[PDB]
Write a protein that binds this ligand. Structure first.
Ligand SMILES: COc1cc(/C=C2\SC(=O)NC2=O)ccc1O
Length: 328
């Protein structure tokens, strides 16, 4: 069978926490007063929720309300428990309340409002300095939730809300997040296609916090190289081929061989043979103001096939890429 794997950091946080902390199926939701919140406008709709801008009429402050579409009580309690566990942590979105919506007959999560800048505006105008600054802010959030026993599993640009006017960042949509338990096998059907780690694409279930670091690397590559998304696969199989055309097929085989993993035979016809590329291949006159030796080395150290070889969030914050970022 496949060789087992454990996280190289924060391996035992949940074992030494009280069972109440991670046993989310036993969580008892504390309900607020639904009439405190008046919906103002629909902002979006996923497959698991509808999101609204609203006003809290007890302080006339803006909030955002996420009305969960009927999903199983464990997935609802999982998101709720994780948000409560992480509340107040650096750059974690704040769950302000939970109310029972009378129309949907499901829970509606009430978040602090973030006056976020247009995402396309953000992609187009962030500077070299901005990218380093906000990457550091994301790493604060990821080191926090990893240190708290939780992996996000859906790191992508649309879940990183940025109020550029106040240089404020919040990591949102914990609905795919999970507690990390050593030896646990997890569903590989997480994350958006372009941000899925090699472990998901080869069906390796015993993964950990390091999945988020691959996703973060995919974001970094899209920003410094001006190609969004960077690995642009047409499906989950082509997604791994896109990665292998950059990282090379020989290290892909080293990865699956280390964990005694077998590729889906459907790759026999599509994978090919590819050398590993040097990152300078993706530099050109329209992105070179965002590229530095420090940026390329940092990216190189996030985007490893072997989840065990990637920088941890804490290690990443030590990287020379961030030396120029003003610390508070
Ligand atoms: C879309 O504007 C916001 C969204 C959120 C949080 C969300 S939205 C979703 O689907 N899951 C979350 O945690 C919080 C503040 C906002 O201003």
């Amino acid at each position: 069978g496949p060789v087992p794997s454990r996280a190289r950091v924060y391996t035992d946080v949940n074992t030494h926490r009280p069972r109440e902390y991670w046993d989310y199926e036993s969580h008892v939701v504390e309900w607020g007063n639904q009439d405190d919140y008046q919906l103002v406008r629909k902002l979006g709709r996923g497959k698991y929720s509808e999101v609204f801008e609203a006003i809290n009429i007890t302080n006339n402050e803006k909030v955002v309300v996420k009305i969960l579409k009927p999903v199983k009580k464990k997935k609802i309690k999982r998101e709720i428990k994780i948000l409560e566990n992480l509340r107040g942590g650096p750059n974690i979105i704040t769950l302000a309340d939970i109310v029972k919506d009378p129309v949907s007959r499901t829970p509606a999560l009430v978040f602090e409002h973030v006056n976020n800048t247009d995402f396309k505006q953000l992609y187009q105008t962030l500077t070299d300095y901005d990218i380093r600054f906000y990457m550091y802010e994301i790493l604060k959030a990821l080191d926090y939730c990893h240190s708290m026993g939780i992996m996000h599993r859906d790191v992508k640009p649309h879940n990183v809300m940025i109020d550029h006017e106040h240089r404020k960042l919040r990591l949102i949509d914990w609905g795919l997040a999970e507690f990390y338990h050593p030896g646990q096998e997890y569903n590989v059907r997480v994350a958006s296609r372009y941000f899925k780690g090699p472990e998901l694409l080869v069906d390796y279930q015993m993964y950990d916090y390091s999945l988020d670091m691959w996703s973060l690397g995919c974001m970094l590559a899209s920003m410094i190289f001006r190609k969004e998304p960077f690995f642009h696969g047409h499906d989950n199989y082509d997604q791994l081929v896109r990665i292998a055309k950059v990282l090379g097929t020989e290290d892909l085989y080293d990865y699956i061989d280390k964990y005694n993993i077998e590729l889906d035979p459907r790759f026999n016809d599509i994978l090919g043979r590819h050398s590993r590329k040097r990152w300078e291949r993706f530099v050109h006159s329209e992105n070179q103001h965002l590229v530095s030796p420090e940026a390329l080395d940092f990216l190189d150290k996030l985007l490893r096939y072997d989840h065990q070889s990637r920088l941890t969030a804490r290690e990443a914050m030590e990287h020379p890429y961030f030396y120029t970022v003003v610390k508070d």
